[PDB]
Amino acid sequence: GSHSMRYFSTSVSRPGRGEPRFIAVGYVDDTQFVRFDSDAASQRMEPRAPWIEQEGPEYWDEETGKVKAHSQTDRENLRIALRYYNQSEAGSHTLQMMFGCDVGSDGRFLRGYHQYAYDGKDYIALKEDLRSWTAADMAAQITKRKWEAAHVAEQQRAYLEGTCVDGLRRYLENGKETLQRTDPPKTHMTHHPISDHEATLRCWALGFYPAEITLTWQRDGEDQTTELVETRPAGDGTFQKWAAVVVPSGEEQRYTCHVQHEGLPKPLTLRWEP
Amino acid sequence: KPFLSAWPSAVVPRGGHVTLRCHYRNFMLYKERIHVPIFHGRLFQEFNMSPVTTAHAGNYTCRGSHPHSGWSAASNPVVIMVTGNHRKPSLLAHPGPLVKSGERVILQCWSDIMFEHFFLHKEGISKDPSRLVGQIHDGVSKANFSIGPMMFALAGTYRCYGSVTHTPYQLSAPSDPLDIVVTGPYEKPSLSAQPGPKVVTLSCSSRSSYDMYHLSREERRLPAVRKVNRTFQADFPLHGGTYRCFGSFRHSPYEWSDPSDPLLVS
C-alpha cells in the first residue's frame, strides 16, 4: 500500500545550560531508521534500524554532511527568530522542522512536505503544489518574502519529486521484511467492577504493526463513544492500544469490542465472557 | 560536566562587566593553578566581575558543589579576553566587504605595533575568536583570516585585536569595525536614474518585497516605498561614476540581493 518517509528535527536554545541542541530522526512509516544528535560524540548520522546498516561508507558521509549543514542552518534560524519576534537572548526556544514525501502502492509520488514550527506553533509550510508557501504569522511573512525572492521552492520541489521518492523506494526494498510487514493484533478483554451497579470492560490490542488501528465498542450495535488511550510503542517495533467502557452490571453481553487492522483478514468482534 | 558560560560576552572592555555562570544540577572557579580555587577558595553561589580589570583575563573552568560524592568534574573552557590594553590594529577586506554568497574573503588585520597574536571577532557571536600568529613584514605585523564560504551566519560586523607575547589574553583596543555583507541569492533589482545618467536621482525598483535598498558606487541606505504597480522602490539623491544597488529585508541588514546591473552616471 501507501508509504511515507519523514525527517523530523528539533532545535532548542538553552542559554547558560548548553550550546543550542539539534536532534534529527528519519522515519519510514512508523519505523525510525537514522538519528543525528548534536550533543553526542559521533557528531555524525547513525543507523537506528538493521536494514539501513549495510549502506556503504559514502552514504553515511553524505548524510552526515547534509544533517550537519541543517544543524548550522537551524541554529542561525533560532537567532533570526529572536529578531523577528523581538525576544530576549535569555529565553529557551524551540525550532522544529519536518520534510519528506509519500508514495502510493505503485511507488509513484503522492505528496511532499517541508514545514517549520517555532515554539510549538506553525511557522511556514510548502503548499501541496510544491511551488508556494503558507506563512502562519507576520514573522513568517518575512521568511516567505525572502524565500520567494530566492525562488527556493524550486529546490524543494526537485528534492521532493526526485531525491526523496527515490530514497523511499530504495528503503522499502532494503527493509522489505520489516517495512512491508503486517503484524495483526493479539486481542483479549479485561473486566473490573467499579461499583455495586457498574463495571469496566477493557478491550486490548497488543503486538501489531503498523500503528494505525480502530478499536470501537458497540452496545447492541450502536457505538457508545468510552475511553480511548493513545496508541503506544511496545519497544520492539509493535504497538499497543486499549479502549474501555463503563457498563451496567448484567449487561456485559450487550457490549462488543470491534477491532479493525490491516493485519486482520476480517475485523474482530470480541464479546466478554467470565 | 558543568556548563560554563560568560555573559554577556567573553570579550569585554576593561571597565566593562562579565558574569561567569556555572550551571550544575554553589560553585568554585579555576584558571589554567589547575587545582587552586580562585580568590583563595571563594564559593560564588549566585561570579560578577565588575569592573573588569586585566587580572580577570584568563582561561577558566568551574566545579559545582556535589554533596553525594563533594564536587563535580571541571566545566567547559571559557577564555575571558580583556580588551583595551594597546593601540588598535587595522582591519581590511580583500577584495572587499561585499561577498557573493558561497565565495570567500580575506579579512586582513595589521598594525605598526608588533603583535604576537591576532584575534578576529564577529560582533554578537558567542563563538571563541579566531586566533592567528602575527607575521612580520616591513615594519608591520599582520594576519590573513580566511572567511567563507559566505552565508548569512558569516555576515555581520567584525573587529580584530592584537595581543603581545607574555599577555596573550590582554587584547588591544578593537580595530574600527568592518561590515561584511553576503549578496545573493535573492533576485537582483533594477537601477535607473532621473531624468537620466548624463546630467540626479537614482531609482531602485523590483517586484520582490525588499524593505531597504542600498546604493553602492564603484555605501548609502534608504527605505523602499510600496509605490504602486506592485513595485518597491527607493530614490537616492546625489561627479557620477559606476553605481549598483541591492535589496535588503527587515531584521537582516547584512544580507543583500544579487547586485543590480551596473549603471554609469557620467
Binding site: 548524510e63 549543514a69 542552518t73 520534510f99 514573522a139 526523496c164 | -
Partner: peptide
C-alpha cells in the same frame, strides 16, 4: 536521503 537545508529565515 536527507535534504540540503541551506536557506535562512
Amino acid at each position: 536521503t536527507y535534504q540540503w537545508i541551506i536557506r535562512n529565515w
